[PDB]
């Protein structure tokens, strides 16, 4: 097995994804060896997902013949599940990412969002607390929880966060449709 | 790829150790398919090590590794590791599972770290050290009669380089 293929596979398994704008060599190596990487990851019940438009390569749970495997009981998955509050915040961030990606042209940039923009839109649904410090603590805690899934970054000195492109593959239309169906079932009885 | 082979490989990669007494089916599947496991773990720069004497299957870095973090342990953990290793060696020289009472190790810890002057302090120190070693998966759960079980992995605790370092540190501590 070639050294570069092994290095790229190990790096991707370690971090969970490869981005072209940060690790171009490994991204190119892993992009041109789809069959080899798939054969390597088959024994581990894992698969590789590709996105050439955004320059992204990520790792997902391989789909089995069982109708429902729940995709979270896989032994190698270490994170916890996602509850309703985090799903709501993810939906808000996805809307912001749509807005960012629509009005962009050729060139490299990043999606930055300030907390003060996020606070009122979440107040609309969750409600309002007495002081401002309470709401700031709530938002900071939620963003810290979301950082563990690799969806955002830590707060800057100017009180801003970066939205990672991987969210575009977490809230793709299929997953959104499934979530909407499930939530509609939950609400109506 | 057979389902049992994949299950055994995934379990071993999750835990790092396989014992026949705990998961006999996975142990049998892994021990009868050495070449398949080696082929599977080759791209990940990992290899399988077998100890049929105790039924222990472990993973070694075949050749500082992207998937593995190196750690260093303090003297308060190193001397307890030495004590547990020598206790397990004494137990296996007598010929199952090595059972060590909590009160047994208290004098051995006091003769090297001094006496705290309180039974509660000694109990808390022993419990904290045992929990820290439980984090590394070196001992089993505490028994009802204040006893712990030493896992066979202590036999392959490290290479002889670390054993030499451990015995040198133990001798220096005994010197005081």
């Amino acid at each position: 097995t070639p050294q570069r293929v092994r290095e790229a596979v190990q790096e991707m398994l370690k971090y969970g994804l490869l981005e072209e704008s940060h690790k171009p060599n490994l991204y190119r190596s892993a992009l041109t060896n789809i069959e080899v990487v798939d054969r390597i990851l088959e024994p581990l019940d894992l698969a590789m997902g590709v996105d050439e438009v955004r320059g992204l390569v990520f790792v997902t749970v391989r789909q089995g013949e069982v109708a429902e495997q729940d995709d979270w009981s896989h032994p190698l998955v270490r994170r916890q599940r996602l509850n309703l509050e985090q799903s709501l915040l993810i939906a808000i961030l996805r809307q912001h990412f749509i807005a960012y990606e629509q009005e962009s042209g050729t060139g490299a940039s990043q999606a930055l969002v300030a907390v003060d923009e996020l606070i009122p839109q979440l107040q609309v649904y969750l409600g309002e607390l007495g002081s401002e410090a309470k709401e700031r603590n709530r938002i900071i805690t939620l963003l810290d929880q979301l950082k563990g899934h690799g969806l955002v970054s830590a707060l800057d000195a100017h009180d801003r966060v970066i939205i990672r492109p991987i969210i575009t593959h977490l809230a793709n239309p299929e997953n959104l449709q499934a979530l909407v169906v499930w939530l509609r079932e939950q609400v109506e009885g | 790829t057979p389902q049992r082979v994949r299950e055994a490989v995934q379990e071993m990669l999750k835990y790092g150790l396989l014992e026949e007494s705990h998961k006999p089916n996975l142990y049998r599947s892994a021990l009868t398919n050495i070449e398949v496991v080696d082929r599977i773990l080759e791209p990940l720069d990992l290899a399988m090590g077998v100890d049929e004497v105790r039924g222990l299957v472990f993973v070694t870095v075949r050749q500082s590794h992207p998937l593995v973090r190196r750690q260093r342990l303090n003297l308060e953990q190193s001397l307890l590791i030495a004590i547990l290793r020598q206790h397990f060696i004494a137990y296996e020289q007598e010929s199952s599972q090595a059972l060590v009472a909590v009160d047994e190790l208290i004098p051995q810890l006091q003769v090297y770290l001094g006496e705290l002057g309180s039974e509660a302090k000694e109990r808390n120190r022993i419990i904290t050290l045992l929990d820290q070693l439980k984090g590394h998966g070196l001992v089993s759960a505490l028994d009802a009669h204040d006893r712990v079980i030493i896992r066979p992995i202590i036999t392959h605790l490290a290479n002889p380089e670390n054993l030499q370092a451990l015995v040198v540190w133990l001798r220096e501590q005994v010197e005081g």
Binding site: V59, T60, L76, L82, L84 | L13, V68
Partner: peptide, 27 residues
């Protein structure tokens, strides 16, 4: 307004699955 519903698990698949930290063999 209920903490029970805010922490109820939702349905969203694991994407970008990182490995389980280590193979649990520190050495």
């Amino acid at each position: 307004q209920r903490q029970s519903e805010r922490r109820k698990p939702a349905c969203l698949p694991p994407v970008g699955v990182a490995i389980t930290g280590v193979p649990a063999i520190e050495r």
